[PDB]
Amino acid sequence: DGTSVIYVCAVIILILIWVAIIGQRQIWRHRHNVARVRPQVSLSSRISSKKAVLLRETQLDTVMRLRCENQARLTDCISLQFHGEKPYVHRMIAVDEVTLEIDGQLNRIEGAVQRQAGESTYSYLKRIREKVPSIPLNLVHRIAFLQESARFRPEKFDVEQVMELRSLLNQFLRILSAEYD
């Protein structure tokens, strides 16, 4: 009877196929131990869809842009109730003075805007001076140095430096408003 031979051949080949597939799957499962194999930080290593990976990469880029743009405003109404008398209040005033006097004033249609990445007072003032060459090169350098000395440098920063920075900012704004009526 050939039917019995066909049946037994089918049974043995089916069992062999099943055991081979399940053994390969079991080997794969055993090898992929998540407590032994070091993972990858890449999002594409866990998410197969390219659209979701791209969306999350864009969200991470937006978060990094926010981190760059997230700058503390030291000169604040309730932050001056604190400090106020402490010796470092003057540099706190100075670091925000440049921002308030320039960005808060030059936030118009034709005014320049500080870049979100690589935010530099020196580079921003250079960009402004490129459009408006009336401002001397000494003015921008001195203003940038005053703000940088307030922010980072151990040299004595006091009311005199704050007054100098305010006078230079007033001169800069006066010339820039003369050039921008």
Binding site: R38, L74, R91, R151, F152
Partner: protein, 1432 residues
């Protein structure tokens, strides 16, 4: 046909395999499509996908699944496979959920291969964008009680099982990701009854493995700024908290609603929210500064600062849902746990590896709300059996039986507000090892931890740290005080000289007020107290040639201590090896540190071009001396003390200064210092001193004002106390009582002012067995002043300082003493012997490490670059500052009145102000000079005649030497170049032009000056005291305390240089330890009628001084003054009738009066000397023999190989001899006196008139008291004398000769008897000790102890290893120290046999004992070379 059945079977195979192994994929596709559509996941930006699921097992509650992925924009949750069982066959116990009863686990979840990857925190960043109106960011991202109760009743216990799981924290913008992994997580989530809340959710479970680490992000663009981790475990990255098991219990109240009228309380009915973590075996728990930087980066990303001033949270009111108040964390270490701190110093991996015992817990309460004070979080760590070790060559750091930390950290509302850290440290029975390398290591660790990021005002947050360290139940600090800071790194039997400070309570407080942004100066104050039963113990290597001597001295000294021994310490309780020499009840040390913070100005993020940036910035300093120095105020007080004084105290103080505040701050193992090429020697030295890698402000100097005050010091002058006589009280160790010792050091940039002030000091000497009485010595005061002059010319910045002038001034007050003879003379002799032996320590002296042999230029003795410039070489040998500096010592002793009292004789030695000066650049000569100025010293003697109820004393003899003014010019030191004088002159005038403090170099005088005179700057521009120092004509005491109120004029004697217009000594009450509970009457009368009678007034009653109130030591000194010998005018007698290069006057005059009774009294003294000889300890004899060996440098005939050195010329003397006036007298029943007068002589060699006259007290009857007795002369004269050697009457004269010659013969016989007595005693006692040591089986008494690994580093190591007569003596020291029969020599013992009187037998006994000892000695005897000539 076969084709049809083949097609059918192929279809069977395909369909069956697909439906049994691949239908899950299509079912998962369908369910993935359905789920995100029905709940709108894709619309809400959620990526969801299922790679496999089963539908046929629903009627068994089983739902298999595979490749389940869930991403919501913040974290990715991925599961490789698993199954979800709902065991519906388990009956529901109740209609409604009863939280108070047990429920079956109807829900069972198994997850295989769980991934959780947290890469973003969109909520906080969206909140920040909303609060800052960043509209651009907000658009680019493109973004029920009944049911709860029924579901929790239906599910019962949620059994969640995770075979393997990993948690990854990080994204593409973080350099490193936090990888947390575990295995075999079995957990049971349950809901139970909760007080004040809806329900309590508990998440218990265990994990059979857990590990956390920081792994490298592959997407990151690492630059040179990024720093690699100190250590990695292969691909796992930097480890953190490895463990073998973890048991976790997470509890969280499910919040309800407020029912009371008042809002939710902050302290009452708090919702429960806790977390418990119990760790098993193999917990390693590493960390470090690099891990801290990575933690800061990851946390700052995932928890960004909004820079918003917070507000006190509004507590929910009635009817509103409650909120969580705080979270409690409890971490328990159930086994022994390691806790390591790893950091990098250059290219070497350093570590602080600690350990804690089982059941060491960490508690952590974190407030989850904000109040009007902001928010805070607590911490309570407890480490049992906490043991710490370092990575240095000396790895021992710390150990205690319990360590408790209580930290409270408060954050105010404003993000910029001042934080407050309050940390309390508590130790129980803690012992520590302190080396200066530990301070260097911890400073490097702290600097690495802080980092190199620049300070930003927009990121600056002020904060104070309140540190309070407490040690209870005993503390112990061990300091390694090996000479030249050698260390033995052997784990066992470390042969290190160690000093341990022990006590009951130790305190340490330190506030860190970092409340200013880049302040010009930062001030930090430290306090440290040892508060009860404080002691100082000293240990020496067992075979160091100091330990046996010290142990013998301690065993044999008969000292009574007022301070009970301290039971504290852990490694210093072995009294046989540890010597407890100091005992006090309080030691407080205060530190006041003012410093300019070291800002790395190269890290300032300046976008301005450097060309114009330098214009605005101030010019940088070219030299470290151009900077304003830092400040450090040190204030140490020792409240009281009971001291076992010895020279080892001085030695240990010197080693402390060298190893902790001197050039030798760095340890050196005794196994590494093997370098012979100076080129590579300099290279290794250069690498450690990386001057080019540091800014100029790193080498900023520091002004230090040290004030050390030691109060109420009772010191035991340890010696070999004599033998005990049965009928007499044992003679104890002499005791010195000092009320206060004040030490002030004022070190500035260019000079240091060392000033030591001592109050009046007593010395009570115990009454001897002879019976004369107790002795006393009184010192009115002592002051030391040292002016060190500094310069930085041609000095390496690592040293940054060379000393070219060193002026010292010793001022000794009035010395008054009343000592008995010969006991107290012997006491002084052996006190000086032990003191000098221990201070010098010739066999204990060690070679300086080659890398530590600094020069005048800050480089090494060998391979010095500046000397290389001379003779045009790369490197040459410079010379040390000791050989080149100008040193000058001024010594002044206001007075000296010592009386030696015998039964029938006293001998008073009185002196005038004595000045001694040592000047190595005296006048124009730059060689060692000694100047002696003794205006007068007299010796008087009184002989007691007791034929009356009142004592009768006569001036038997007199002496007087006046006008001694000698200038000694010692030759140049041997092995010194011929041009040392020129080199020293150039060195001195090079490092002086900037200051001109040594005025004698710039004076325009033909004859230069010295600090011998006032031609130097000494504590001021004008040296007032030094101007008239050598002017002894006025005879004016120099120790007169006073206050000088001119800041430019130098301060007077006993006037603090730290304070202003204040004496260095303050009379303040302090703690002290109380006491625990001739032979013929006719001849003597005949001499009394002629010789001047005197009254002797001894001190009234020498008692034991007690400190009591301030000034009581002064009162004891004032009561026991010097003995007075008062002359009587009515009994005045015949004592007065009379008629290399060395320069100066030997003496102005030399008086001498002698009578036969005076020589009789000298005989009395000599006889008393010999009587006390058998009562002397043989140990002092062993000590003196050993002193001979060591002072000879062990120059045996066997050790002559080591001595191959290979004044000798130009010795000239020009001195003036005194006018000698000798007056003799002799009376016998009648009075004959002979007067000798030698006029002044001079040596170039001449003489002068000599008059010898023999008078005769013959009355005015035969051709004011004795008005009838003139003097009739028999004269004899010599006109002059020049020696040039350059390289009846009988009847009256007979009684004179037969008396003077008889007395002289008796004196000479007595002297010979004393000499032979001493020799016989020496031989007999040495033989006795040798025999007793030979017949001893005690383990400690042995020829050689240990391996003597430290002996290789000692000078004269080869010599002492081949003084076999000195190794044997060291064994004898060990016999005195440890043998049980050693107290067999504390008996007053004469010769055991009458045979020992004969010389030959007593010498042969000693020779035979030496022969017996030779075989035992020779086993370890290391012979230098070989002497076969002596062997035969």
């Amino acid at each position: 046909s076969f084709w049809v059945t083949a097609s059918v079977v192929t279809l069977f195979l395909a369909w069956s395999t697909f439906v049994v192994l691949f239908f899950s994929r299509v079912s998962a596709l369908f369910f993935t499509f359905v789920i995100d559509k029905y709940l709108r996941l894709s619309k809400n930006g959620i990526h969801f996908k299922i790679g496999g699921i089963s539908i046929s097992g629903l009627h068994a509650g089983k739902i298999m699944f595979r490749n389940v992925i869930y991403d919501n924009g913040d974290m990715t949750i991925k599961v490789n496979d698993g199954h979800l069982l709902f065991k519906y066959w388990k009956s529901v116990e109740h209609r409604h959920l009863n939280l108070s009863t047990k429920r079956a686990s109807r829900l069972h979840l198994v997850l295989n291969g769980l991934h959780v990857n947290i890469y973003n925190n969109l909520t906080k960043y969206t909140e920040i964008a909303r609060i800052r109106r960043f509209d651009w960011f907000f658009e680019n991202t493109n973004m029920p009680s009944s049911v709860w109760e029924n579901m929790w009743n239906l599910l019962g216990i949620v059994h969640i099982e995770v075979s393997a799981g990993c948690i990854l924290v990080g994204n593409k913008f973080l350099p490193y990701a936090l990888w947390t992994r575990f295995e075999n997580l079995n957990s049971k989530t349950s809901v139970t009854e909760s007080a004040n809340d809806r329900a309590l959710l508990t998440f218990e479970g265990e994990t059979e493995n857990v590990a956390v680490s920081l792994i490298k992000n592959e997407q990151f663009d690492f630059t040179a700024k990024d720093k690699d981790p100190p250590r990695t475990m292969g691909n796992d990255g930097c480890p953190l908290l490895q463990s073998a098991s973890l048991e976790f219990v997470y509890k969280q109240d499910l919040l309800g609603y407020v029912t009371d009228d008042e809002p939710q309380s902050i302290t009452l009915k708090l919702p429960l929210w806790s977390s418990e973590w119990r760790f098993g075996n193999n917990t390693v728990l590493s960390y470090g500064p690099w891990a801290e930087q990575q933690r800061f980066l990851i946390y700052s990303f995932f928890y960004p600062p909004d820079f918003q001033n917070s507000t006190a949270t509004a507590m929910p009111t009635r009817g509103k849902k409650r909120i969580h108040v705080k979270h409690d964390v409890k971490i328990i270490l159930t086994k022994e746990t390691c806790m390591d701190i790893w950091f990098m110093r250059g290219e070497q991996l350093e570590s602080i590896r600690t350990r804690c015992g089982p059941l060491s817990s960490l508690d952590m309460s974190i407030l989850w709300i904000t109040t009007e004070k902001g928010f805070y979080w607590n911490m309570k760590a407890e480490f049992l059996n906490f043991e710490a070790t370092t990575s240095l060559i000396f790895t021992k750091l710390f150990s205690c039986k319990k360590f408790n930390v209580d930290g409270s950290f408060v954050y105010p509302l404003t993000w910029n507000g001042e934080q407050t850290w309050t940390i309390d440290y508590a130790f129980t029975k803690a012992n520590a090892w302190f080396v200066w390398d530990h301070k260097r290591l911890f400073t490097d660790l702290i600097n690495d931890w802080i980092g190199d990021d620049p300070s930003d005002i927009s990121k600056f947050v002020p904060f104070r740290v309140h540190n309070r360290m407490k040690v209870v139940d005993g503390f112990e600090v061990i300091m390694l005080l090996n000479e030249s800071n050698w260390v033995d790194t052997a784990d066992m039997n470390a042969e290190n000289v160690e000093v341990a400070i022990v006590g009951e309570k130790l305190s340490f407080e330190c506030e860190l007020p970092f409340v200013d942004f880049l302040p010009q100066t930062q001030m930090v104050k430290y306090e440290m107290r040892g508060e009860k039963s404080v002691a100082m113990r000293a240990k020496f290597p067992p075979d160091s040639a100091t330990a046996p001597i010290r142990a013998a001295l301690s065993r044999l000294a008969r000292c009574n201590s007022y301070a009970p021994p301290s039971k504290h310490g852990t490694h210093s309780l072995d009294t046989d090896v540890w010597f407890e020499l100091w005992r006090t009840e309080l030691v407080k040390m205060d530190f006041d540190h003012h410093y300019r913070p070291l800002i790395v100005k190269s890290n300032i993020p300046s976008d301005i071009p450097f060309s114009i940036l330098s214009d605005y910035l101030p010019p940088p300093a070219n030299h470290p001396w151009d900077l304003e120095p830092d400040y450090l105020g040190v204030d140490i007080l020792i409240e009281g003390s009971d001291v076992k004084f010895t020279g080892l105290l001085v030695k240990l103080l010197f080693e402390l200064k060298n190893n902790y505040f001197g050039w030798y701050d760095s340890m050196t193992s005794v196994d590494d210092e093997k370098i012979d090429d100076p080129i590579k020697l300099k290279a290794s030295f250069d690498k450690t001193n990386a001057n080019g890698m540091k800014p100029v402000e790193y080498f900023r100097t520091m002004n230090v004002d040290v004030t050390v005050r030691v109060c109420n010091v009772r010191a035991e002058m340890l010696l070999y106390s004599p033998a005990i006589d049965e009928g007499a009280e044992p003679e104890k160790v002499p005791v010195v009582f000092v009320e206060e010792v004040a030490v002030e050091v004022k070190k500035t940039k260019t000079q240091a002012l060392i000033q030591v002030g001592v109050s009046p000091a007593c010395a009570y000497l115990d009454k001897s067995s002879q019976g004369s009485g107790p002795g006393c010595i009184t010192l009115s005061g002592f002051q030391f002043r040292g002016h060190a002059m500094y310069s930085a010319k041609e000095v390496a910045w690592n040293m940054g300082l060379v000393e070219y002038g060193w002026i010292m001034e010793i001022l000794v007050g009035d010395i008054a003493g009343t000592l008995d003879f010969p006991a107290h003379a012997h006491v002084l002799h052996q006190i000086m012997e032990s003191l000098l032996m221990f201070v010098i320590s010739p066999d204990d002296a060690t070679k300086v490490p080659d890398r530590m042999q600094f020069c005048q230029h800050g480089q090494l003795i060998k391979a010095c670059s500046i000397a290389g410039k001379k003779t045009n070489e790369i490197l040459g040998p410079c010379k040390t500052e000791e050989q080149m500096k100008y040193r000058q010592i001024r010594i002044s002793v206001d007075s000296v009145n010592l009386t030696f009292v015998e039964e029938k004789t006293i001998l008073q030695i009185s002196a005038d102000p004595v000045r001694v000066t040592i000047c190595n650049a005296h006048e124009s000569r730059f060689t060692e000079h000694v100047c002696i100025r003794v205006p007068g010293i007299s010796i008087r003697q009184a002989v007691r005649i007791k034929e009356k109820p009142e004592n009768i004393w006569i001036e038997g003899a007199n002496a007087a030497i006046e006008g001694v003014s000698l200038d000694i010019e010692l030759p140049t030191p041997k092995s010194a170049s011929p041009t040392i004088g020129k080199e020293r002159l150039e060195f001195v005038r090079m490092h002086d032009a900037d200051t001109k403090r040594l005025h004698f170099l710039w004076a325009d005088h033909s004859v230069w000056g010295c600090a011998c005179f006032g031609n130097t700057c000494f504590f001021g521009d004008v040296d007032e005291i030094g101007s008239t120092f050598m002017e002894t004509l006025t005879k004016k005491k120099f120790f007169v305390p006073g206050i000088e109120r001119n800041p430019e004029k130098q301060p007077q004697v006993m006037q603090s240089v730290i304070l202003k217009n204040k004496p260095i000594l303050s009379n303040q009450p302090h703690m002290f330890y109380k006491k625990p509970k001739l032979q013929s009457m006719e001849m003597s009368s005949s001499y009394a009628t002629f010789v001047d009678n005197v009254r002797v007034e001894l001190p009234s009653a020498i008692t034991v001084p007690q400190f009591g109130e301030p000034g009581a030591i002064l009162e004891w000194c004032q009561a026991h003054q010097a003995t007075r010998i008062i002359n009587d005018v009515n009994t005045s007698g015949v004592n007065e009738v009379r008629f290399l290069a060395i320069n100066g006057v030997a003496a102005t005059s030399l008086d001498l009066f002698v009578t036969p009774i005076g020589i009789e009294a000298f005989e009395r003294l000599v006889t008393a000397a010999s009587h006390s000889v058998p009562a002397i300890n043989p140990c002092i004899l062993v000590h003196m023999c050993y002193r001979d060996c060591v002072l000879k440098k062990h120059r045996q005939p066997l050790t002559e190989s080591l001595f191959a050195d290979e004044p000798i010329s130009e010795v000239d003397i020009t001195v003036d001899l005194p006018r000698v006036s000798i007056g003799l007298f002799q009376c016998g029943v009648t009075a004959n006196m002979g007067l000798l007068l030698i006029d002044r002589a001079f040596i170039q060699l001449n003489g002068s008139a000599i008059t010898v006259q023999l008078l005769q007290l013959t009355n005015r009857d035969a051709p004011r008291m004795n008005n009838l007795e003139p003097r009739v002369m028999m004269d004899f004269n010599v006109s002059d004398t020049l020696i040039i050697l350059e390289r009846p009457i009988y009847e009256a004269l007979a009684p004179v000769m037969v008396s003077w010659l008889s007395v002289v013969e008796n004196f000479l016989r007595t002297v010979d008897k004393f000499i032979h007595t001493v020799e016989c005693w020496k031989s007999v006692a040495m033989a006795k000790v040798l025999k007793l040591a030979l017949d001893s089986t005690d383990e400690k008494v042995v020829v050689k102890v240990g391996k003597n690994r430290m002996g290789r580093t000692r000078v004269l190591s080869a010599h002492q290893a081949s003084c076999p007569s000195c190794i044997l003596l060291k064994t004898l020291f060990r016999w005195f120290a440890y043998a049980g029969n050693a107290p067999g020599a504390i008996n007053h013992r004469l010769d055991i046999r009458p045979e020992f009187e004969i010389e030959e037998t007593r010498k042969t006994a000693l020779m035979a004992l030496l022969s017996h000892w030779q075989s035992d000695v020779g086993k370890e005897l290391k012979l230098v070379s070989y002497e076969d000539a002596h062997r035969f």
